[PDB]
Design an enzyme around this catalytic site. Structure first.
Site, short mmCIF file in Angstrom:
data_model
loop_
_atom_site.label_atom_id
_atom_site.label_comp_id
_atom_site.label_asym_id
_atom_site.label_seq_id
_atom_site.Cartn_x
_atom_site.Cartn_y
_atom_site.Cartn_z
N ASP B 88 0.72 -1.21 0.00
CA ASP B 88 0.15 -0.15 -0.08
C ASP B 88 0.85 1.09 0.11
O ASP B 88 0.43 2.28 -0.64
CB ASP B 88 -1.06 0.06 1.24
CG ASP B 88 -0.45 -0.37 2.47
OD1 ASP B 88 0.77 0.24 3.04
OD2 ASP B 88 -0.66 -1.20 3.20
N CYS B 152 3.63 -2.30 16.58
CA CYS B 152 4.74 -3.18 16.53
C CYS B 152 5.48 -3.61 17.76
O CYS B 152 5.99 -4.77 17.53
CB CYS B 152 5.88 -2.43 15.76
SG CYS B 152 6.59 -1.00 16.55
#
Ligand SMILES: [Zn+2]
Ligand SMILES: [Zn+2]
EC number: 3.2.1.183
Lengths: 288, 283
Positions: B88, B152
């Protein structure tokens, strides 16, 4: 013996050297680096003309002149040689790419860790120069919303945390408060505290010192992490007097906070002596 | 009408489109985004042969397929077409390069500012993919030694600060303590936090000043790494963040990199445009 002249306009001193194709620094001159430019150019010409003349004597075919940092015009005219110029951070990268642990590598970074912090970025085998020529300003990667002040005028910069100057500021602050020296340490009348002293205090049990150093290495580490998440390089070469010190914590910061996707990166310390001169030299050597 | 088959894989719905070499989105097919890949892979090929079927009816030569995010294996075999794939962020950048405000630019960066933060770096008219193919993980630029926790696992990520999820989390927080609603309004989220700010709330404004700063500091980090000529902010939150981003740069980036231009994206369905652009860029 194919060779080039390398000029290093760096800290305090101005160095010119005859460098061989294989990376041997045949002869090396160092002198005071005039602050004013009109004079700095003059000195360079002289030192070059002497180096050049000597190369004729020393059985060396000099291919050109490389300069780490209107310099081209006067040198090429006088010395009848091509001149190449780039900044110290880029030259450090080029030194590694040609003679150092960058040989072969497609995409890597060279982070200079000494008095100041800077670097160079090789990608697709080439330097990234930038639209305004000032790419890879690695000393001013910001890892804090409210950090220490930086000589660039901003705050939070990794240079503000982990540079040799940065640490010296911290070393002086503690020594001024009698909080630096510990378990025997003694500073000479002439000499004045610096990073080694801070490190030695830490290594001899100085909690305040250890804390300061922890933050400096963490900041730098997060600096490197920022690079990894931007460039995803295969190698990071720490280079300069503080490289040996910072390598362990940088790796830890990389293991701790970097993405899984970029942990295969390898961090190393440079082996190269006089990288600026080797890098300057490498521009001439490469082209010709 | 020399065209391509663009395909988008994002949050919630799945999208597919026919896109002209000019950049016109001819037809657009939306649908569910299944739980499983076995369910998800079945839909795609169906949507493609559906679309591929239409293309020819609207006199359009599909040169191939492009996908935002071994799928080439089923599709190339079925459709009889070259299939390209990229993420993306990169597609956001490729969209700006071929069709957006990156036209002709050698060095520029596209930063997605929406539900998440991410992007793509174009240097020498080309994508940086990186050593292990993880270049331009821009949402995980760190601007704190002790920030907010991030998806993350680490902390201080610009995504952790400025993402639409980041802002939404902050929107729930205030609203749980009943200190988010203010004279002028009535599923909490980022857009509300902005209105509460706009319509007078100091805590909202405070949370935003930090978010925008964190982001701008991320942008600054990019400027000091790449020295791009342009930075394109793309996404639902771009219109919002552009002023503060311009200020952090003004207030903190080096003189050297102040010539940078920051802009908000024009493109609609840049994901699909970027995908299509891969097919069209290899003719
Ligand atoms: Zn700075
Ligand atoms: Zn993160």
């Amino acid at each position: 013996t194919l060779s080039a002249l390398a000029v290093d306009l760096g800290g305090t001193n101005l160095r010119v050297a005859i460098v061989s194709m294989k990376g041997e620094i045949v002869k090396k001159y160092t002198q005071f680096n005039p602050k004013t430019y009109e004079e700095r150019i003059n000195l360079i010409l002289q030192m070059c003309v002497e180096a050049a003349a000597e190369a004729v004597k020393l059985n060396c075919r000099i291919l050109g002149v490389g300069i780490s940092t209107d310099l081209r015009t006067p040198l090429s005219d006088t010395l009848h040689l091509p001149v190449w110029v780039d900044n110290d951070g880029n030259c450090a990268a080029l030194a590694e790419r040609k003679f150092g642990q960058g040989k072969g590598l497609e995409n890597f970074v060279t982070l200079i860790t000494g008095t100041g912090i800077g670097g160079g970025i090789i990608h697709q085998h080439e330097l990234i120069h930038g639209s305004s020529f000032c790419a890879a300003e690695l000393g001013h990667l910001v890892v804090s919303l409210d950090g220490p002040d930086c000589s660039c005028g901003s705050h939070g910069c990794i240079e503000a945390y982990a540079s040799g100057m940065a640490l010296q500021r911290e070393a002086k602050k503690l020594h001024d408060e009698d909080l630096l020296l510990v378990e025997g340490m003694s500073v000479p009348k002439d000499e004045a505290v610096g990073a080694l002293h801070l490190i030695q205090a830490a290594k001899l049990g100085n909690a305040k010192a250890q804390s300061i150093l922890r933050t400096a290495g963490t900041a730098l580490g997060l600096g490197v992490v920022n690079i990894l998440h931007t460039m995803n390089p295969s190698l990071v070469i720490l280079s300069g007097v503080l490289a040996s010190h910072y390598i362990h914590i940088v790796k830890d910061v990389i293991r701790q906070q970097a993405l899984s996707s970029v942990q295969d990166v390898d961090v190393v310390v440079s082996d190269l002596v006089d990288p600026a001169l080797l890098g300057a030299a490498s521009m001439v050597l490469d082209y010709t």
